[PDB]
Amino acid sequence: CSRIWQSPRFIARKRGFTVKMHCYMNSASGNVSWLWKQEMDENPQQLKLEKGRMEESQNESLATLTIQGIRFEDNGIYFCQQKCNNTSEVYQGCGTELRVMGF
Amino acid sequence: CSRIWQSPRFIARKRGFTVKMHCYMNSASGNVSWLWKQEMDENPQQLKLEKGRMEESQNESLATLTIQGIRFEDNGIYFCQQKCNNTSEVYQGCGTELRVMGF
Structure with missing residues (x-):
């Protein structure tokens, strides 16, 4: 199968704004998901796409994840994951590392 | 083969200091090679070693790249590759990402 690329490595924004996280492939057994991780030891875990604040999007080449109303409680690192066909x-x-902040 | 694990993810250090980067693998068809990216737009372009001040070492399971007296020209992201046996x-x-400082 194919290989995936995540962008960007890091993001810092202001409380209440909006974020976009990308990932690229070719849908070779596409259909992408997103994992989240707050601690460093613990390992990545399924992200719950909170109604009206988060949305998993995806066409055949780009799989973007968009979060609005950014809360501090969102801090952490997010990973897009794909399961291969073959x-x-x-x-x-x-x-992508996420950090919310300021005024 | 084995999932490669590079560490640390990102580093900040004043110029001149030396820096080590890690890459954990399994060495089966291993023998690691290091790549470089001066920006995110660019593509992982191969790394050329310079006069005793950039040495890559490794063994059974730990490949590690070392840079002495760092400069702003070093800023960027470093990756490690390993062909797979099977x-x-x-x-x-x-x-691991690098950013040199000014003081």
């Missing part, structure tokens, strides 16, 4: 193995993106 | 696939780390 290899039936899971490739992970390199994730 | 697969003949090309795994790659999530690269």
Whole structure:
């Protein structure tokens, strides 16, 4: 199968704004999901797309994840994950660090 | 083969100091090579070593790239690759990022 690329590595924004996180592939057994991680030891875990604040999007090449109303409680690193058709193995993106802040 | 794990993710250090970067793998068809990216737009372009001040070492399970007396020209992201035994696939780390300081 294909390989996935995550952008950007890091993001800092102001409380209440909006964020976009990308990932690229070719839908080779496409259909992408997003994992979240707040602690460093614990390992990534399914992100709950909170009604009216988060939305998993995806066409055939781009799989973007968009969050609005950014809360501090959103801090952490997010990874897009794809399950391969052939290899039936899971490739992970390199994730994006998220930091909310200020006025 | 084995999922490659690069560490740390991002580093900040005043110029001149030396810096080590890590890459954990399995070395099966291993023998790691290091790539470089001066910006995010650019593409992971190969790394050229310079006079005793940039040395890559490694063993059974730990490849580590070392840079002495760092400069702003060093700023960027470094990745490590390892061909795979079985697969003949090309795994790659999530690269460690570098930013040199001014004081």
